[PDB]
Amino acid sequence: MKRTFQPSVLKRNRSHGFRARMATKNGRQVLARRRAKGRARLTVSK
Amino acid sequence: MIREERLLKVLRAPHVSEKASTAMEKSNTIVLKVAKDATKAEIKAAVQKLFEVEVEVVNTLVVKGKVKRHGQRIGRRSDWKKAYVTLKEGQNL
Amino acid sequence: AVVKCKPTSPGRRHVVKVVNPELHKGKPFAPLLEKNSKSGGRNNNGRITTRHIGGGHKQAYRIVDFKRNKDGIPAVVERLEYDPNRSANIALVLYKDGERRYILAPKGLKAGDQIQSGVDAAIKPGNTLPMRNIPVGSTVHNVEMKPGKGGQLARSAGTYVQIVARDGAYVTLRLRSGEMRKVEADCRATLGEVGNAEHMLRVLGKAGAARWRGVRPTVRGTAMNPVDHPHGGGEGRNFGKHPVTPWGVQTKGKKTRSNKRTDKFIVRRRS
RNA sequence: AGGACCGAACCGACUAAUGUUGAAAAAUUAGCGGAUGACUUGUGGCUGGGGGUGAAAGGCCAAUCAAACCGGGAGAUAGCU
RNA sequence: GCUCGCCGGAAGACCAAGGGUUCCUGUCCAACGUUAAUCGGGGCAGGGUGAGUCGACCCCUAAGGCGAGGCCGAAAGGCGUAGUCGAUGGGAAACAGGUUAAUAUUCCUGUACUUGGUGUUACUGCGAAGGGGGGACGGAGAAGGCUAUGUUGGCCGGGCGACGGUUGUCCCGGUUUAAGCGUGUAGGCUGGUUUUCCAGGCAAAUCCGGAAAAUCAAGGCUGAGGCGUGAUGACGAGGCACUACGGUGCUGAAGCAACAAAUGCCCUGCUUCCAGGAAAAGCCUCUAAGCAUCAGGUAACAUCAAAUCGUACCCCAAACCGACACAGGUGGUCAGGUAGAGAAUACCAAGGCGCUUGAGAGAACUCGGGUGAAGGAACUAGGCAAAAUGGUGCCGUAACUUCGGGAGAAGGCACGCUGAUAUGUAGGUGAGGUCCCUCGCGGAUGGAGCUGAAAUCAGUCGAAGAUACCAGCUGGCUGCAACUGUUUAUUAAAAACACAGCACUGUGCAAACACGAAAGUGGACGUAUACGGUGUGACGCCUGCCCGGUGCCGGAAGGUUAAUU
Ligand SMILES: [K+]
Ligand SMILES: [Mg+2]
Ligand SMILES: [Mg+2]
Ligand SMILES: [Mg+2]
Ligand SMILES: [Mg+2]
Ligand SMILES: [Mg+2]
Ligand SMILES: [Mg+2]
Ligand SMILES: [Mg+2]
Ligand SMILES: [Mg+2]
Ligand SMILES: [Mg+2]
Ligand SMILES: [Mg+2]
Ligand SMILES: [Mg+2]
Ligand SMILES: [Mg+2]
Ligand SMILES: [Mg+2]
Ligand SMILES: [Mg+2]
Ligand SMILES: [Mg+2]
Ligand SMILES: [Mg+2]
Ligand SMILES: [Mg+2]
Ligand SMILES: [Mg+2]
Ligand SMILES: [Mg+2]
Ligand SMILES: [Mg+2]
Ligand SMILES: [Mg+2]
Ligand SMILES: [Mg+2]
Ligand SMILES: [Mg+2]
Ligand SMILES: [Mg+2]
Ligand SMILES: [Mg+2]
Ligand SMILES: [Mg+2]
Ligand SMILES: [Mg+2]
Ligand SMILES: [Mg+2]
Ligand SMILES: [Mg+2]
Ligand SMILES: [Mg+2]
Ligand SMILES: [Mg+2]
Ligand SMILES: [Mg+2]
Ligand SMILES: [Mg+2]
Ligand SMILES: [Mg+2]
Ligand SMILES: [Mg+2]
Ligand SMILES: [Mg+2]
Ligand SMILES: [Mg+2]
Ligand SMILES: [Mg+2]
Ligand SMILES: [Mg+2]
Ligand SMILES: [Mg+2]
Ligand SMILES: [Mg+2]
Ligand SMILES: [Mg+2]
Ligand SMILES: [Mg+2]
Ligand SMILES: [Mg+2]
Ligand SMILES: [Mg+2]
Ligand SMILES: [Mg+2]
Ligand SMILES: [Mg+2]
Ligand SMILES: [Mg+2]
Ligand SMILES: [Mg+2]
Ligand SMILES: [Mg+2]
Ligand SMILES: [Mg+2]
Ligand SMILES: [Mg+2]
Ligand SMILES: [Mg+2]
């Protein structure tokens, strides 16, 4: 059957990518939380 | 006119393999490992300067580095650029 | 002409078509076309603000001269055309200096007819004049509400307005709704009725015909649940409520006009 | 000509058996409906939680829906076990 | 290796998405692989992806996004103008052969093509952020002309058969060739030219639009395919020589015609309908401020450049989405033979596979199937399930009906093979030939050869000829819903929803109404034959009485009545 995850890299990057995060202040707060946690991977970009 | 300092840096190693031996023995092509950001014009000028042979044409490709393991640790070898440089039939490097 | 389709299928049994074979069978006149993409009844918040809109056929917009401003220059009707944007047909006219325009096609107009606008135009269908140069008693259409703004009144197929009175700088119009309304006598109108009066005789015949027109189905309030609509809920069929809109406002009789700015122009409500 | 007819692809999902620590957190097999249309499908986009969307089943909104998910108020409160 | 079996509109082949070394070679078998494993998509090491023409990048825009100023909003922010992004769409150019263990339209061979930068020569008004043209667009249907492709014959090479026959109307194989260039064909569209003139194209214009003239009638555009060339080439049935027995090296004959033929092409055509069918650039052209024997245009030639990134491999799957090497899901392209209406189906080709536990035994019982005496729904909630019907042509077909239907109603008859008619018919296709020329890819007559159903009359085999696969059960009475549709993803598909149609009611446009502190936006670039809400639900005949209650509409005298004062 069709499951919920159907990958598209374009849609992934547009929805959750680094620049999408930087586009809004709440996105930048996501990035700030993740840096304060010390994530090795800030976004789905890499 | 590319600079000689730029030219001295873009040819890293000669590539040694059966495909490279056969390119040399069948097509008068030498296979080289070049700098990652080396362009075809740069590679051509660098070979025409430092190896002193006439170059007909340069073909290029990017080899992606393999994923390897090492003591239960994943890692990745670097990408690196390969150049097939064709000589003019009688140059004989 | 009005024509009933033969019942060679249930969806065709009730179809009544209005066919005008006078209408140009070719493509429109391209310099006077714009794209108009669909909304689905959604506004710039992306929310549905008018229900029951979506789908239907692609349509190009025909730029139509509602201002009728080229005074003193006669134009000849080249052809009548179908306009998907409106019930009225439109007429491509060619002015003597070479300009082509689209106008609302009035009843009785055909290719070869001459039309004119201005204070000097002759009083005949398709001619446009300020309503102070139009005799009291005239049937007009495409009537302005403000001078120079362009026609806003009586544009739909078969409609018209009657100039019933003129008092100095204002005329009293009888509009198709039954309303008596004041309009500045400097407003322009086109003589005659809007053509294509048989428009209202068509019978769609099936659901898909309304779908082609970009109308989406209406779900009755009483068919929903209480969370969805004031009419919702109840075992079987039950109403026990004064009928209201989806947002709780009485929908059988309760008046909703509220404009103290324009009250002074209404001589008599439509009743 | 047709929301026309029969019938594959394609879309669906009426009946039975199987399966129910499954081959599968909804399928398989034999039959079944639509199949030029209110059809179907790819890519991208928009609508955001008392909000959306709904040919309306309280349906659906990432295997979650009479108020999603994550984090926080938070060690809510628990005359109950 | 030899047999066997399975798929073959796929279980073959190529892509996109997605994945990312899984690709190839050597080695290893701990763990992983539902068993063993010498094997692997496993471990380890090494190798492998070559582009002016393919794709990205790039020019261009759609929805939509962001948005200098701006408008709005306690703050955060919202909306939006100029702009700027954004493909799923528009925009230049390459083909065939060969080759690697693993890449190839990228390497090699052979033959092409496009865009720009210069550098000369020659005629030379160039110039846009502006004007026009073009790009540029729907559905359905019909028919012709073709090709891909196939079949036969001819040709060429080979064979003379493990068992009766097989030198023949016998058997097997092959019979392939591109882009480009020339030719402008079937066919589609349009009258062509040259002048004077003008309230239109934000200015202007020699362009476009419009008008008025004379003149000439075949000019212009598009266009499959075919032919010629590309091609003395390549490839090529086979044969010969090595083998490091995995394959390479060398050599190479025929390379034609007729018929059949697409869902592909001509065709973005034609015909027709209503629901009336993107944008912008590339491109052509027109001129403005401006440059004006300068720049700049055109054409020729010469010479430069065409970067960067992707390219391995899987891709209906053991490599993607499903925790699995999981009977699930996943968009596009290719389309052979016999039979068949067919992309159904059966058997096959090219190709690819036997599904990663086996071996025995032949109990109950479970699952999936085959057959069944007599009876034939007695079963059961219920004919659930099963059994049954099933094709084509023709004969024939009831109530009722909205005149379309009901209808494939029902019911029935024929059906294989062989021969004759007719050494192969009706029909299609159509060579040589002769004639004519607005002289060619011409047209008329000509009909050789090829292909070719149906029928009728005889005969003939079987129990059975729509023989397999495939493939309607039928009728009668009645409730409900007019109908096609929609629905509870995952126990409900229905009488529920929708529906065309009907009615009430609101709404005069800065509409009502809806999203929104607002600005705004939808409604709608619509304007009462319109739009919103509500109920009813095709059609036919109809739709009675009640305004006391509640609501809504109207009313303005009197009572009651807020802030205020
Ligand atoms: K109800
Ligand atoms: Mg490359
Ligand atoms: Mg509505
Ligand atoms: Mg309705
Ligand atoms: Mg309900
Ligand atoms: Mg309520
Ligand atoms: Mg009830
Ligand atoms: Mg009651
Ligand atoms: Mg149908
Ligand atoms: Mg599919
Ligand atoms: Mg099934
Ligand atoms: Mg049906
Ligand atoms: Mg069908
Ligand atoms: Mg769910
Ligand atoms: Mg709650
Ligand atoms: Mg607390
Ligand atoms: Mg607690
Ligand atoms: Mg690996
Ligand atoms: Mg392998
Ligand atoms: Mg072992
Ligand atoms: Mg093992
Ligand atoms: Mg491996
Ligand atoms: Mg090259
Ligand atoms: Mg935009
Ligand atoms: Mg904005
Ligand atoms: Mg700003
Ligand atoms: Mg852009
Ligand atoms: Mg694209
Ligand atoms: Mg390969
Ligand atoms: Mg052919
Ligand atoms: Mg088709
Ligand atoms: Mg490949
Ligand atoms: Mg397996
Ligand atoms: Mg699988
Ligand atoms: Mg099949
Ligand atoms: Mg047994
Ligand atoms: Mg059994
Ligand atoms: Mg049996
Ligand atoms: Mg029996
Ligand atoms: Mg019996
Ligand atoms: Mg019986
Ligand atoms: Mg009984
Ligand atoms: Mg009993
Ligand atoms: Mg049954
Ligand atoms: Mg059966
Ligand atoms: Mg009953
Ligand atoms: Mg129904
Ligand atoms: Mg149905
Ligand atoms: Mg269900
Ligand atoms: Mg469903
Ligand atoms: Mg069900
Ligand atoms: Mg508005
Ligand atoms: Mg009813
Ligand atoms: Mg009802």
Please provide the DSSP assignment of B42-89 as one string.
HHHHHHHHHT---EEEEEEEEEPPPEEESSS-EEEPPPEEEEEEEE-S
* D strand bases under 7 Å from protein CB: 1-4, 26-27, 37-39, 43-48, 52-58, 62-63, 66-67
Of B41, B39, B79, B78, the closest CA to residue B62 belongs to B79
3-state DSSP assignment of residue A16:
helix
Residues of chain C with CATH 2.40.50.140: 1-113
Ligand 15 centroid distance, CA of B52 (Å) = 82
Ligand 9 centroid distance, CA of C8 (Å) = 13
Q: What is the nearest nucleotide to C230, using C1' and CA?
A: E534
Q: What is the nearest nucleotide to C15, using C1' and CA?
A: E500
Domains: count for chain B: 1
Whether C189 and C123 have beta carbons less than 8 Å apart is answered as: no
Q: What is the nearest nucleotide to C250, using C1' and CA?
A: E552
Half-sphere exposure of A44 (CA within 13 A, CB side): 13
Whether C103 and C90 have beta carbons less than 8 Å apart is answered as: yes
Residues of chain C with CATH 4.10.950.10: 195-271
CATH class of C195-271: few secondary structures
Which superfamily does CATH assign the domain made up of C1-113 to?
Answer: Nucleic acid-binding proteins (2.40.50.140)
Tokens of C67: 């201002």
Q: What is the nearest nucleotide to C47, using C1' and CA?
A: D47
Distance between the alpha carbon (CA) of A1 and the C1' atom of E369, Å: 30
* E strand bases under 7 Å from protein CB: 17-21, 43-52, 62-66, 76-77, 79-80, 87, 100-102, 106-108, 132-134, 136-137, 198-201, 209-211, 273-279, 305-311, 320-322, 328-330, 402-404, 482-484, 490, 496-501, 504-516, 520-523, 525-539, 550-554
Tokens of B81: 């650029």
Distance between the alpha carbon (CA) of C27 and the C1' atom of E224, Å: 27
Which subunits count as partners of chain B given 3+ CB pairs below 8 Å? none
Q: In degrees to the nearest 10, what's the CA dihedral of C17, C89, C164, C267?
A: 90
Tokens of C114: 């001459």
Tokens of C262: 């324009």
Whether C95 and C114 have beta carbons less than 8 Å apart is answered as: no
Ligand 45 centroid distance, CA of C110 (Å) = 69
Q: What is the nearest nucleotide to C222, using C1' and CA?
A: E535
Of A38, A43, A39, A45, the closest CA to residue A9 belongs to A45
Whether B83 and B43 have beta carbons less than 8 Å apart is answered as: yes
Distance between the alpha carbon (CA) of C96 and the C1' atom of E125, Å: 34
CA distance C74 to C146: 24
Tokens of C69: 């401003």
Distance between the alpha carbon (CA) of C186 and the C1' atom of E130, Å: 36
C83: CB partners within 8 A, 6+ apart:
C62, C64, C89, C90
Distance between the alpha carbon (CA) of C45 and the C1' atom of E199, Å: 47
Where in the sequence is the domain holding B63, given as residue range(s)? Answer: 1-93
Tokens of C230: 């004031």
